Amino acid sequence: MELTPDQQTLLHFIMDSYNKQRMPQEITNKIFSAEENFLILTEMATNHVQVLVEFTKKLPGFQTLDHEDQIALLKGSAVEAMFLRSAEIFNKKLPSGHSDLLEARIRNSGISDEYITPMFSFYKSIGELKMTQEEYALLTAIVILSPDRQYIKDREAVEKLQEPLLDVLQKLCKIHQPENPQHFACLLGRLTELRTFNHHHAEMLMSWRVNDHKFTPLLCEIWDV
């Protein structure tokens, strides 16, 4: 019923990996002019990708995977892992009366309403769940270790890594929310909404290159642009 000592070590390992990956408390509060906006967005995205790789690397069993499968998982999960980690900050690191200022600031910039509206709908939707930092870290590792990604040769090897993380998360959902027995189903339900961002991001990327905005070599490599 409760988390076994092995599950607690596994959770604590993941949490240590998740905390060692943190963006500045200077860049968060400060979050500007028109052309400087397109430069901050390119730094934000690079920072997400740098943090995502560092985190993934440390996931139990990831280093035992085929080198091509590792690249496919990284490339396939980057957008979804980025939207999930931003939701963690938006709901838990940053207060209610602060997220709204960030929404207005991002809208008044270049970026499309077709991109912003679903982005904040997801943040409000996932925010209602009152998720702990352990729930965000496990859901991020689950999103990354998706066996259904394009170019995955050994799918069962990825499924073997993902299954124990889903087990810990299912237990954490009862222990922290026994009043709402559907909390876990709601968390997995939020992943369907999270998968739509792959299409939205790809649209936003084609507009980025024609509006003559710069891409860093890392962003070009992870998204093929």
Partner: peptide, 11 residues
């Protein structure tokens, strides 16, 4: 994919 492998393989 030069940068991505570097980030994956580095110590």
């Amino acid at each position: 994919h030069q940068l991505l492998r570097y980030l994956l393989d580095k110590d």
